[PDB]
């Protein structure tokens, strides 16, 4: 009942189950718990898009740039998956905007690839590297015409 | 599909592989996600035997194309998420160009909501001194090209393509994969015209790993037409 409380806040970060990581918390769980793949409960807050959650965990200290064994950050997570808010608040509390997972991409790399213009837009207003390139030399430019984003495109351009 | 809806978001990920090359037995696990939406999958693998007897890069190919970006304008040639649930079989050979060959056997399916990709992995014909047993290619992965026929002789896919591995000497080894995978289910299925599929890897090593592993980062996304 009172045992695995970092596995019990994983999983209800993941499930977005605010009530449960609110008990969790006030009832000491480790905000930076782990698993073996270095996942944290901020990383799958920030993937599944359940921003109270994310608000929270960072309230008691999540660390913001924290990285799986993929060299994933929230920050990527977020950045991916469209969650613009959750981008916002991630910056807000210093997210690293040029953390590089293991394929060498930025969060600039992943959004624009995704076709998320606001989330681009965004990341390039808080300092991102416009030219900067994946082990493959791709730009967030290429992969945006990669995948037929105009207006990321002619966005990136600009700076 | 009905199937392709089944890959909306994340979706976890098991792997078992049993092999033998020249005889040398072993056994590998993997577990992670993917999320077919930005062709993307995380994942993580042990040899549960003690060292692995042929290299890490041999068996990338080997360790779910259900998971790769189909866009919308290619929604139709999607076999292997038509495919599913009831999955289907997936079975190749690989020719290595001066060297042995594999033979696999593969079953993907969903079992409860966890797609799993179970192998069978038979080896022969290689050089005890070449580059596969002898640990020779580099801890590297390239960007590839698959592409895909549409096999109406079994109500699946036939597919050629070939994978370069480099050497720790700057040297190159090809490794030509001829494949074949039809459903397990007798629901329909969707047929492919020919397209590619394209690639990026990243393998890395989890410092608090002591048993032989690999860590694969990959993003797959089917491309065009032939």
Known sequence: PGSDLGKKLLEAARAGQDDEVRILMANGADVNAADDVGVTPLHLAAQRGHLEIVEVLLKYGADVNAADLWGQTPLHLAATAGHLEIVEVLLKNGADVNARDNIGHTPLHLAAWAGHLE????????????????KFGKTPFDLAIDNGNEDIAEVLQKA | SKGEELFTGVVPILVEL???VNGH???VSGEGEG???YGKLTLKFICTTG????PWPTLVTTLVQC???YPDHMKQHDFFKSAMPEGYVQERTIF???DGNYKTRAEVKFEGDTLVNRIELKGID???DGNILGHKLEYNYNSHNVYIMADKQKNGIKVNFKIRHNIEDGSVQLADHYQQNTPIGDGPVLLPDNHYLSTQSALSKDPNEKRDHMVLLEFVTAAGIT
Not at chain 2, 51 to 54: A, E, H, I, T, W
């Open chain 2, 96 to 98: 290595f160009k001066d």
């Open chain 2, 51 to 54: 060292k692995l007897p042929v």
């Open chain 1, 119 to 134: 989330i681009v837009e965004v990341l390039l207003k808080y300092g991102a590297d416009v030219n900067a390139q994946d």
């Open chain 2, 126 to 128: 290689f050089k005890e």
């Open chain 2, 18 to 20: 049993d092999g033998d």
């Open chain 2, 67 to 69: 998971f790769s970006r």
């Open chain 2, 25 to 27: 037995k072993f056994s």
């Open chain 2, 35 to 37: 999320d077919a939406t």
